[PDB]
């Protein structure tokens, strides 16, 4: 029981916005069971409780209405892949607000979306992922999903 009608104005001004660029891998974790804000919340727990620390790699992320595409410049857990739309049906940051402290030397944000497993319909499992360039934060990654993917109004205002 929710009442609520969206306010799904104009999509054309959100689609005239896009981000691009380069992000740090932490980790997906199968969510089978999990799901939702929950599910987000999991794989962070299960990115610091299993040892020793992950290995996180470098990759490209793409967001567009056709869902979420990444790739990769290293060749090694894998080369291309994308999500349809019709999957991503949740995204935004961990929950537990928890960082990710990068093997240089400091923290950062960690973020990451639940869809459905491109192999089976029935397998959830989330991606988790970390703020690489400080330029395009999380924050402003996420947010314009659940912007566009989901379909939330706009946050900050804009004249004209």
């Given at each position: 029981g929710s009442s609520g009608s969206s306010g799904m104005s104009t999509a054309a001004d959100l689609l005239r916005q896009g981000a691009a660029c380069?992000?740090?891998?932490?980790?997906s974790v199968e969510t089978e069971s999990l799901t939702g804000p929950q599910a987000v919340a999991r794989a962070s727990s299960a990115a610091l409780s299993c040892s020793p620390r992950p290995t996180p790699a470098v990759?490209?992320?793409?967001?567009?209405?056709?869902?979420?595409?990444?790739?990769?410049?290293?060749?090694?857990l894998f080369f291309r892949r994308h999500y349809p739309v019709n999957s991503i049906t949740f995204s935004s940051t961990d929950p537990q607000d928890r960082r990710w402290t990068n093997p240089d030397g400091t923290t950062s944000k960690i973020f990451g979306f639940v869809a459905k497993k491109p192999g089976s319909p029935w397998e959830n499992v989330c991606h988790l992922f970390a703020e690489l360039d400080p330029d395009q934060p999380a924050g402003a990654i996420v947010t314009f999903i659940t912007k566009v993917l989901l379909g939330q109004r706009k946050s900050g205002p804009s004249s004209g």
């Amino acid at each position: 029981g929710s009442s609520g009608s969206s306010g799904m104005s104009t999509a054309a001004d959100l689609l005239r916005q896009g981000a691009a660029c380069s992000v740090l891998y932490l980790t997906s974790v199968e969510t089978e069971s999990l799901t939702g804000p929950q599910a987000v919340a999991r794989a962070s727990s299960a990115a610091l409780s299993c040892s020793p620390r992950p290995t996180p790699a470098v990759v490209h992320f793409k967001v567009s209405a056709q869902g979420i595409t990444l790739t990769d410049n290293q060749r090694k857990l894998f080369f291309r892949r994308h999500y349809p739309v019709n999957s991503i049906t949740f995204s935004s940051t961990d929950p537990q607000d928890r960082r990710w402290t990068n093997p240089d030397g400091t923290t950062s944000k960690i973020f990451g979306f639940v869809a459905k497993k491109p192999g089976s319909p029935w397998e959830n499992v989330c991606h988790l992922f970390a703020e690489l360039d400080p330029d395009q934060p999380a924050g402003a990654i996420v947010t314009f999903i659940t912007k566009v993917l989901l379909g939330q109004r706009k946050s900050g205002p804009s004249s004209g």
